[PDB]
Amino acid sequence: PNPCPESSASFLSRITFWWITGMMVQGYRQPLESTDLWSLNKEDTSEQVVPVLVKNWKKECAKSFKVLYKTFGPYFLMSFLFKAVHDLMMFAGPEILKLLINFVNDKKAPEWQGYFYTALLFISACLQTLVLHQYFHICFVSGMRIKTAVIGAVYRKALVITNAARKSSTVGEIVNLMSVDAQRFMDLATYINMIWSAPLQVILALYLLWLNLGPSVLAGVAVMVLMVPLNAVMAMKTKTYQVAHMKSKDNRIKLMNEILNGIKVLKLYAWELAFKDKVLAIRQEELKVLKKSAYLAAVGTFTWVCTPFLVALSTFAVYVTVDENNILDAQKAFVSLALFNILRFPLNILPMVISSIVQASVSLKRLRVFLSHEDLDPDSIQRRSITVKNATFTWARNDPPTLHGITFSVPEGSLVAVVGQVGCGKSSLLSALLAEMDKVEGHVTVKGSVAYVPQQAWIQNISLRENILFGRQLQERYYKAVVEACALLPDLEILPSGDRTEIGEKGVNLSGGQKQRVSLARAVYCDSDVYLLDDPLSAVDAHVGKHIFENVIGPKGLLKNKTRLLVTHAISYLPQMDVIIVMSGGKISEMGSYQELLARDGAFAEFLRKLSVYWDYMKAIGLFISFLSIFLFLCNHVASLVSNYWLSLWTDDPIVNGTQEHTQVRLSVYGALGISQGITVFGYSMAVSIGGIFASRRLHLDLLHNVLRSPISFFERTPSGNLVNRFSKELDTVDSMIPQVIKMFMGSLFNVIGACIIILLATPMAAVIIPPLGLIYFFVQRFYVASSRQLKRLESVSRSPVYSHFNETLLGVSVIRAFEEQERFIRQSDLKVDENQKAYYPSIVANRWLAVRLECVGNCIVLFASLFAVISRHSLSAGLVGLSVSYSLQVTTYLNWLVRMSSEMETNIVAVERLKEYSETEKEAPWQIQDMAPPKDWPQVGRVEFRDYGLRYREDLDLVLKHINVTIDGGEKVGIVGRTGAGKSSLTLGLFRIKESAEGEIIIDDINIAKIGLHDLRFKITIIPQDPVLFSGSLRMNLDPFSQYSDEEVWTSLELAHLKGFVSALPDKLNHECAEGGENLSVGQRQLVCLARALLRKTKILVLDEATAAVDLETDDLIQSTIRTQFDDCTVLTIAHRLNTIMDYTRVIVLDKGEIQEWGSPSDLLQQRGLFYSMAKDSGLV
Amino acid sequence: XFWGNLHWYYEQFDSTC
């Protein structure tokens, strides 16, 4: 249908991975999706791979598990042959190089011999790239084949495992066993060969180095060896700084979560500037830990660049000095220098290898423990209606037996009832028949199919139709009858989508009663012979249970001639059921029918009784720091190329009398240039890392100001999760990732340019081969960077359903084995694992594709460089050819970094633009103009007047308020009342200028507020919200976050508020640590705290929103009693629902529509027979 | 993505390089 092209591709195609080239070029043109993705190979599929492991595990287990990993041994054994060949081919370049340098020096030689070496060099290097990436393919395949197998085995085991063994581990730990431990065996499969390969590679590297120079070459090996423990110590110190940074980050995010949630109250109080300073105080504590991390990193990039110099200097300095007769030739100097770069890789990768093999041995032990658990005995219950003979059941393999001496038989097509007190083993009885408990003695058998309904209902996250169907073919007539009979139609109609929706696990939440009603229906629809109902009756009402019991479970219901054993706490439905079974602490006390069992008077009777974005980042770091870093960078790369060119002159000088003439003079200058290089490496490393902290500080302070200057409309239209993700994800990218990447990218780019400059400086004919190879490099990079990111994205989104599915399986183990649908859920899991590998297999081949193309362009640069030297022998000297070829031989490595760090850059720079997202968005009015600033005239009277005022909720919508004209004198207590969805709430938003006046004017004390600054208005008037939220921190801070006025003022305010009793003589008097939106304090306390805030400011115009909405009628009286005496001469404009508060005022205004319908005195409007009289009647109190 | 290592690793040392 859509097979993998690998199997139907030629030999040459498979060697060079040409068969994926089709999928790469396609991936640039259009986006790659899950459908545009090949079928797996037959030998990679779960149903082929998994059964071979579980077979060998069953075989090996019998004899009594690295012995079981001789399943993937045969395929992986081929790996050793390719890798062994690669290690010997690796030490061909330096051996051939020595001959080529001798050739150029030996003038009187046959010329053709040159061309032979340069040919033999290219061929040798090109067989190396092919054999290498064959070795890596069969390693990455064998690792992929282990992941598929391990996941498979773990899943099968999780079904057959016993309750005792499952209670040992957590649901998390078993899901982590499939997610972490199995994932590590993909990785282990790769680098496990380096345990034998790297030491063999080191041993050879040392020996070739020894023949080339002498015992002097130890001095070089010493340095590189001493860098390994320095790398270890510094890599430990960064991890402790990373954890210190991460702990400080969560404090900032937790505070932002409160600000983003509770902006609505924060804006009304004018606490934007106060909480801006509060976040910045935490941010500076976080930027000091990054500043310590910056100095460290600088030393990290310092040691990397100056190592290949320090080694070279130390080795030559020792060699040259110890004896004057030691002559330094080009054939000695550049071959040893090349060998040192071959020797450098294994020592560095050896600490990572050994580190990872240790962690794999932790994961290997965890699997061995889980796989070698005791499974349930399947032939404990016969499966030839239900009969038991002296059965005894434990929960654990050895434990006090739960059920002891039970002997009961149930006729076919009868209703049985299990009753008793809590902890009588009535819950365990149904678990025993399903073969979950371990049998000790006795005979048990159940006839035909079995349907189960657990106490704690399990509901897998799928379509609610397909949940009740549970993998059965639909029958519309019957499906309608059971859904009706279960009384699920009243619940079905309420749900947003209706018939087909999502589950509370990950979607719309269902109540305890609804969960049972689905779970009951799921069993009913299946239509099995025997039914085991483990207390379905946990519904909202008995009236619901009456409908269900009679229509489904009872003799008049669906299951008329079907065996149905039930266990229940209810005593209501007993006289309907045929026979009742009473238990006593894990033993059947007495069996009998309702009529006869009461007559005996037994236990039963007692039971009933974009370049733009890069320039934005450039302006963020600062232009002085930017230019200084670029200057110090070019100073390093120049100082590097000159030192390597100076080495190539030191080689070329005659031997006068078995001595190299001037050598100490040259050795010094060579030493000096290295210090000049090393100093500038630490320079741009520190300069860039310092710059990253300046941008981090700027972009955070810029973003945090932009958010707070926004209107509340922004916070309604924008999702809260979108804003929280910004501060969390995108800042962390700018802080850590971007500064480290830009120095690795630039470092790589100028090492590639640097290598080309030497090749051109050596051979000017090199020019002609630069545009052809550059054009190839551009196109192979163009397709990879595009296509690769799509495949990695598809892999990361296709791995999440595998863990999501296994977590659901682990919860509903009892149900899956009751209905006996394991085979279904196996195929369900095999399908999901395959869909993950279908994404992962192209992803890994994409890497092999690029690597063969890049290394082929690498081998072309070393070919042409070495060839043009032979074409111009008689011009050049032995030193220039050494330097030219030795550089070109390192190009391949830089091209890999240049392509990677190009892709890493393009993803990370997106985050910079998204931190400046809300820069040009609509901002509210200026916080203070402080030109026409209000004086102390506002409180003198407190006049309020609306002049034909009107507002809209949305920008383009019908008017909410309209024709609002009324005058309020100073000291008057005014009431505002209406019906639901009138717009009385909107008048509070207008008074505080949350939404700017859509049409008309609003005046306070002969001074128009529409022109005046927001914060000057916001302070001068106070508000009591509906649900006053408390911000986490001090209670002293919660009352006054500025802390301007005295502490006695805070006490005398809490004294008048009558909250004196609370936090009176607690050790936390004033500085009590509140948290979680004021969870510590109760509902009533919150109203008194916000009243105290108003009693501290003592403003002459107050407003109350839902003051008497779901109050305990204790703080309700305290609110009203304080309002009377404290705010006696002060104006108040109250928004209330209940009439009791509204009735006790001088003036009241009534509006149902957008217009003011009625206004006057409460006593006057009752006599006038207005809308107030109608409202008062409808309320109840007249 | 290691400390003082701009060595190219074709290996996946526990991925998340």
Side-chain angles (χ1 to χ4, degrees):
Chain A
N2 187 19
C4 184
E6 185 190 18
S7 52
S8 65
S10 71
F11 169 68
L12 293 170
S13 283
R14 288 186 298 95
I15 289 286
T16 74
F17 304 87
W18 202 276
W19 50 264
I20 197 152
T21 312
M23 189 161 188
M24 298 303 293
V25 66
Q26 189 211 34
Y28 175 78
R29 292 206 198 79
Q30 57 178 24
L32 301 172
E33 60 175 19
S34 55
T35 309
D36 304 340
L37 213 75
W38 301 314
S39 297
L40 289 164
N41 293 320
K42 292 177 183 179
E43 311 314 314
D44 300 353
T45 316
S46 291
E47 294 203 336
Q48 280 292 327
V49 167
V50 172
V52 179
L53 185 69
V54 301
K55 187 177 63 57
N56 287 331
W57 179 235
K58 174 56 177 178
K59 186 170 68 177
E60 189 178 324
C61 186
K63 294 167 190 173
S64 293
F65 71 107
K66 201 182 64 58
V67 177
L68 182 60
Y69 290 121
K70 314 306 174 63
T71 299
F72 320 97
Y75 184 59
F76 190 72
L77 181 60
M78 185 61 182
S79 194
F80 176 91
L81 178 52
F82 286 118
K83 187 56 170 195
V85 165
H86 172 72
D87 281 31
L88 268 54
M89 285 278 101
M90 192 164 193
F91 296 108
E95 284 188 333
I96 290 161
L97 177 60
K98 187 157 68 175
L99 297 166
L100 188 68
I101 299 159
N102 280 295
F103 167 71
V104 169
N105 199 52
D106 288 315
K107 291 200 166 186
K108 295 181 178 180
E111 288 190 28
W112 69 261
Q113 288 198 315
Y115 298 99
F116 173 71
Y117 294 130
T118 56
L120 183 61
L121 177 54
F122 173 68
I123 288 156
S124 181
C126 271
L127 291 169
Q128 195 186 305
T129 181
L130 294 178
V131 164
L132 173 68
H133 295 302
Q134 286 316 127
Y135 148 79
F136 268 115
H137 188 244
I138 66 180
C139 273
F140 269 72
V141 164
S142 72
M144 197 188 74
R145 285 180 187 179
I146 284 161
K147 192 224 189 80
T148 312
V150 166
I151 288 160
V154 165
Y155 194 90
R156 267 82 160 176
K157 189 68 206 174
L159 300 170
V160 302
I161 196 166
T162 191
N163 289 116
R166 197 181 164 284
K167 275 181 281 175
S168 190
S169 300
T170 324
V171 67
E173 191 177 36
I174 297 162
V175 168
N176 281 17
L177 181 137
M178 192 171 282
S179 184
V180 185
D181 299 10
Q183 177 62 36
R184 280 189 170 157
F185 275 107
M186 295 188 96
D187 301 314
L188 179 67
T190 309
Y191 51 74
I192 194 162
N193 283 293
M194 300 302 290
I195 199 173
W196 73 260
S197 193
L200 181 137
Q201 204 168 129
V202 165
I203 286 285
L204 280 161
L206 290 165
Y207 182 65
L208 293 180
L209 276 165
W210 201 93
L211 293 167
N212 215 57
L213 285 160
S216 173
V217 75
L218 290 166
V221 172
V223 169
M224 286 204 292
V225 159
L226 288 161
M227 289 286 179
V228 170
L230 184 67
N231 288 162
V233 165
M234 293 177 182
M236 190 182 70
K237 285 307 310 299
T238 191
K239 193 195 294 186
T240 58
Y241 279 126
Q242 277 187 48
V243 169
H245 167 84
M246 195 64 69
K247 289 286 176 186
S248 190
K249 195 178 76 73
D250 289 32
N251 289 28
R252 192 170 53 77
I253 298 293
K254 190 184 187 293
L255 186 61
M256 280 307 311
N257 276 299
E258 294 170 33
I259 293 157
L260 289 164
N261 288 16
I263 193 72
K264 179 54 174 77
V265 303
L266 198 76
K267 280 239 165 74
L268 284 163
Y269 298 132
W271 286 8
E272 295 139 294
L273 194 73
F275 276 60
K276 191 171 76 76
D277 293 13
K278 192 181 173 191
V279 169
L280 284 162
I282 299 160
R283 180 56 165 176
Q284 283 181 2
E285 193 173 17
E286 192 180 21
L287 286 164
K288 279 181 72 173
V289 179
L290 287 166
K291 183 167 282 189
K292 289 176 186 290
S293 186
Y295 283 50
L296 178 63
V299 179
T301 52
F302 168 77
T303 56
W304 174 249
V305 175
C306 68
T307 285
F309 168 73
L310 281 164
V311 169
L313 172 63
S314 63
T315 313
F316 298 145
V318 167
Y319 178 81
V320 162
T321 314
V322 289
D323 191 53
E324 296 179 321
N325 312 120
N326 277 317
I327 314 309
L328 188 65
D329 305 335
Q331 69 96 1
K332 275 191 190 76
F334 288 98
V335 171
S336 57
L337 184 65
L339 279 160
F340 270 126
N341 287 310
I342 298 292
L343 176 55
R344 196 141 88 106
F345 178 90
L347 276 66
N348 278 136
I349 186 167
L350 198 72
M352 296 186 73
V353 165
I354 292 159
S355 168
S356 289
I357 293 160
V358 163
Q359 287 187 343
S361 195
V362 176
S363 296
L364 180 65
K365 179 60 180 290
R366 281 173 181 173
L367 288 166
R368 193 169 72 76
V369 164
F370 181 72
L371 288 172
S372 71
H373 282 314
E374 291 90 327
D375 69 317
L376 294 162
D377 179 35
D379 203 347
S380 290
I381 318 304
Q382 293 186 346
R383 310 308 306 274
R384 193 179 290 282
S385 178
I386 61 175
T387 181
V388 185
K389 289 181 187 177
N390 294 300
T392 299
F393 296 104
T394 65
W395 275 116
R397 62 185 167 179
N398 186 22
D399 188 288
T402 306
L403 307 169
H404 43 268
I406 50 162
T407 303
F408 77 101
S409 193
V410 179
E412 191 204 328
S414 61
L415 166 52
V416 182
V418 185
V419 291
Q421 299 174 4
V422 67
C424 293
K426 56 147 54 170
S427 187
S428 299
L429 185 68
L430 298 180
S431 297
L433 287 162
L434 293 161
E436 307 201 62
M437 300 182 82
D438 298 351
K439 186 170 70 180
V440 183
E441 296 190 341
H443 151 264
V444 190
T445 181
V446 306
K447 187 177 73 181
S449 190
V450 179
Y452 180 53
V453 179
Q455 287 173 15
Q456 185 175 10
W458 162 74
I459 316 178
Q460 69 201 316
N461 183 42
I462 54 174
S463 303
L464 190 140
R465 184 190 269 282
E466 303 304 325
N467 205 305
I468 295 163
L469 295 171
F470 193 57
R472 288 289 189 78
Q473 192 177 0
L474 181 62
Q475 170 55 32
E476 191 64 22
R477 293 301 314 283
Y478 188 61
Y479 176 88
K480 192 174 174 72
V482 301
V483 165
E484 188 272 311
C486 285
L488 193 62
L489 284 164
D491 301 298
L492 187 139
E493 193 64 23
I494 296 161
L495 291 162
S497 304
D499 171 52
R500 41 175 177 181
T501 185
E502 301 303 324
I503 310 305
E505 192 275 309
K506 190 70 172 182
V508 297
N509 186 32
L510 294 163
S511 59
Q514 293 174 334
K515 286 192 173 179
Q516 291 281 79
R517 210 170 294 107
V518 170
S519 186
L520 174 55
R522 179 169 61 193
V524 168
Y525 182 74
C526 183
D527 192 50
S528 306
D529 302 341
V530 182
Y531 273 84
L532 300 173
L533 301 168
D534 195 14
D535 190 46
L537 283 79
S538 185
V540 68
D541 299 320
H543 186 265
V544 175
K546 277 183 178 181
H547 192 276
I548 296 160
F549 173 79
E550 191 183 320
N551 207 358
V552 183
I553 303 160
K556 295 170 60 59
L558 288 162
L559 309 171
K560 294 205 178 180
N561 296 310
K562 297 175 76 72
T563 309
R564 45 196 197 284
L565 194 142
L566 178 137
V567 60
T568 178
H569 194 92
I571 205 79
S572 47
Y573 306 107
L574 269 55
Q576 288 85 327
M577 293 139 176
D578 289 308
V579 290
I580 309 163
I581 304 177
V582 187
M583 294 207 77
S584 177
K587 185 185 291 187
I588 294 158
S589 55
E590 199 157 29
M591 296 177 64
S593 295
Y594 187 90
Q595 299 299 329
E596 70 184 356
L597 189 63
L598 288 168
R600 277 197 282 282
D601 302 310
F604 187 60
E606 294 175 42
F607 175 68
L608 192 140
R609 185 189 55 76
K610 297 179 70 65
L611 188 137
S612 295
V613 181
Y614 286 87
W615 182 235
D616 294 353
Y617 191 83
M618 212 82 75
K619 291 171 70 174
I621 59 164
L623 272 67
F624 179 79
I625 302 297
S626 184
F627 274 53
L628 181 135
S629 75
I630 298 154
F631 175 76
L632 280 168
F633 181 84
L634 292 165
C635 189
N636 168 47
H637 278 264
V638 161
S640 179
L641 290 165
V642 172
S643 72
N644 286 120
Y645 167 76
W646 180 262
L647 179 65
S648 72
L649 289 178
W650 184 18
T651 53
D652 300 322
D653 40 16
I655 300 154
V656 302
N657 281 297
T659 179
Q660 213 182 331
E661 183 65 13
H662 41 272
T663 185
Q664 294 185 351
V665 172
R666 287 188 177 285
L667 177 55
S668 290
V669 164
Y670 180 67
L673 287 161
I675 299 155
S676 177
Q677 189 185 334
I679 287 285
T680 59
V681 173
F682 180 78
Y684 82 78
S685 291
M686 276 297 289
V688 162
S689 292
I690 290 161
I693 299 155
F694 277 114
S696 176
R697 190 191 318 285
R698 183 59 265 185
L699 291 165
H700 172 271
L701 191 140
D702 190 47
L703 172 56
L704 184 61
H705 189 260
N706 289 349
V707 167
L708 292 167
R709 286 304 317 282
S710 314
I712 290 168
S713 288
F714 171 80
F715 292 90
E716 294 299 330
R717 82 191 181 183
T718 311
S720 188
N722 189 24
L723 282 158
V724 168
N725 187 43
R726 210 165 295 282
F727 285 96
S728 184
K729 189 188 165 185
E730 301 194 345
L731 273 169
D732 195 67
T733 315
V734 169
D735 293 5
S736 65
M737 298 293 166
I738 289 176
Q740 290 183 239
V741 164
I742 60 160
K743 63 169 70 175
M744 285 183 198
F745 167 76
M746 284 292 172
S748 302
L749 174 58
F750 269 82
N751 284 319
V752 168
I753 294 157
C756 298
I757 291 157
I758 296 292
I759 291 161
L760 267 69
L761 175 62
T763 48
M765 287 182 75
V768 298
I769 69 96
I770 298 294
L773 293 170
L775 182 60
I776 289 164
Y777 166 81
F778 166 56
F779 278 123
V780 300
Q781 184 182 236
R782 189 171 176 181
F783 294 125
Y784 180 77
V785 166
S787 302
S788 182
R789 276 185 293 179
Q790 295 283 4
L791 294 172
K792 288 195 300 184
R793 186 189 55 76
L794 284 162
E795 201 281 328
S796 62
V797 302
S798 63
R799 66 153 65 182
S800 37
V802 173
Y803 314 136
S804 296
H805 175 56
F806 182 45
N807 192 289
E808 286 176 2
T809 305
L810 282 162
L811 288 164
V813 166
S814 54
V815 176
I816 297 154
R817 294 189 308 211
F819 288 101
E820 298 184 326
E821 306 194 353
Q822 293 94 331
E823 289 285 7
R824 191 165 78 78
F825 278 75
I826 298 286
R827 285 198 304 282
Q828 202 90 49
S829 189
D830 285 10
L831 180 61
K832 286 169 188 289
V833 168
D834 286 6
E835 277 289 353
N836 183 30
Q837 304 313 313
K838 281 175 71 181
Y840 180 82
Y841 181 67
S843 183
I844 57 164
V845 174
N847 293 298
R848 296 292 84 74
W849 177 79
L850 177 77
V852 170
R853 302 298 173 286
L854 286 178
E855 293 177 350
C856 166
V857 172
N859 290 340
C860 292
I861 293 159
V862 71
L863 163 59
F864 286 128
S866 78
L867 174 56
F868 288 127
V870 173
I871 291 162
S872 57
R873 285 166 80 235
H874 297 291
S875 190
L876 300 177
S877 61
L880 293 167
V881 172
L883 170 60
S884 177
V885 174
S886 67
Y887 250 87
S888 67
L889 194 62
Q890 290 193 119
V891 168
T892 187
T893 58
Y894 297 130
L895 289 167
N896 284 294
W897 278 116
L898 187 57
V899 167
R900 173 52 59 80
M901 288 292 154
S902 284
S903 190
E904 187 64 18
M905 187 84 78
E906 194 168 19
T907 56
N908 289 348
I909 291 283
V910 169
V912 177
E913 191 179 30
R914 288 191 294 180
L915 285 164
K916 297 183 74 72
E917 175 50 40
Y918 310 127
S919 57
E920 299 296 336
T921 55
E922 203 285 326
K923 300 296 200 285
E924 74 203 320
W927 276 350
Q928 59 284 332
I929 302 162
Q930 61 169 26
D931 183 38
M932 296 286 100
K936 297 291 188 290
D937 292 16
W938 285 33
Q940 293 187 357
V941 184
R943 293 294 311 283
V944 183
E945 297 191 339
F946 309 141
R947 184 72 189 78
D948 210 328
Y949 190 81
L951 278 166
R952 305 184 170 85
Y953 184 80
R954 186 173 171 78
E955 290 177 9
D956 298 317
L957 187 62
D958 189 45
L959 280 76
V960 181
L961 297 167
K962 189 180 180 75
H963 209 88
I964 302 296
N965 204 322
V966 59
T967 58
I968 303 154
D969 305 348
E972 287 192 341
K973 308 180 78 77
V974 182
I976 297 156
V977 67
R979 297 281 167 77
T980 56
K984 66 189 173 285
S985 59
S986 192
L987 187 61
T988 313
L989 306 178
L991 187 68
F992 279 72
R993 301 185 62 200
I994 285 164
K995 303 173 189 292
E996 301 301 328
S997 66
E999 192 271 307
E1001 193 175 20
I1002 176 161
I1003 307 160
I1004 293 173
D1005 199 59
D1006 312 311
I1007 294 160
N1008 185 36
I1009 62 157
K1011 298 198 304 303
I1012 294 164
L1014 297 171
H1015 285 210
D1016 291 6
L1017 166 62
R1018 289 283 221 289
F1019 280 127
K1020 285 285 171 73
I1021 61 169
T1022 49
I1023 178 155
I1024 293 160
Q1026 301 88 340
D1027 302 320
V1029 300
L1030 277 76
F1031 298 92
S1032 67
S1034 299
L1035 196 78
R1036 183 58 167 76
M1037 176 266 290
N1038 194 249
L1039 291 164
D1040 189 17
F1042 300 99
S1043 301
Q1044 191 173 17
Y1045 40 70
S1046 185
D1047 186 56
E1048 68 197 332
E1049 296 296 337
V1050 176
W1051 279 114
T1052 52
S1053 66
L1054 291 162
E1055 198 276 317
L1056 290 162
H1058 314 294
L1059 197 51
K1060 185 177 178 180
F1062 211 96
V1063 288
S1064 194
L1066 297 180
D1068 299 17
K1069 286 197 180 178
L1070 293 161
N1071 301 317
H1072 184 276
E1073 187 161 25
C1074 309
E1076 306 176 33
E1079 207 281 314
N1080 294 123
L1081 276 62
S1082 184
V1083 170
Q1085 276 77 339
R1086 296 188 296 177
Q1087 277 83 64
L1088 296 166
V1089 169
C1090 65
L1091 186 73
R1093 276 182 262 187
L1095 285 160
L1096 282 163
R1097 297 204 204 174
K1098 302 183 179 179
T1099 57
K1100 296 291 181 74
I1101 302 97
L1102 182 65
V1103 294
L1104 277 77
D1105 307 337
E1106 296 186 27
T1108 178
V1111 191
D1112 67 324
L1113 307 172
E1114 188 184 341
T1115 57
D1116 187 44
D1117 185 28
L1118 287 166
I1119 283 282
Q1120 292 291 319
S1121 68
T1122 46
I1123 287 158
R1124 186 173 57 77
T1125 57
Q1126 303 298 318
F1127 301 99
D1128 64 329
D1129 74 315
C1130 303
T1131 309
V1132 67
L1133 313 178
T1134 56
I1135 317 305
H1137 290 81
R1138 294 179 66 267
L1139 185 67
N1140 289 31
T1141 57
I1142 291 288
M1143 190 166 182
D1144 189 25
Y1145 289 125
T1146 55
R1147 312 191 80 179
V1148 61
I1149 304 161
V1150 187
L1151 61 101
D1152 176 36
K1153 312 302 178 70
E1155 299 91 329
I1156 296 164
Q1157 300 299 122
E1158 201 66 18
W1159 75 306
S1161 299
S1163 59
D1164 183 39
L1165 294 173
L1166 287 161
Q1167 292 289 337
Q1168 194 168 21
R1169 311 296 170 185
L1171 184 60
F1172 184 75
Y1173 167 57
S1174 186
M1175 280 281 286
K1177 188 169 176 283
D1178 289 322
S1179 186
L1181 196 145
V1182 181
Chain B
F2 226 62
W3 178 255
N5 271 252
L6 212 68
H7 280 296
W8 190 249
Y9 297 123
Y10 288 122
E11 295 89 334
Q12 284 190 328
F13 296 96
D14 241 313
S15 74
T16 67
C17 172

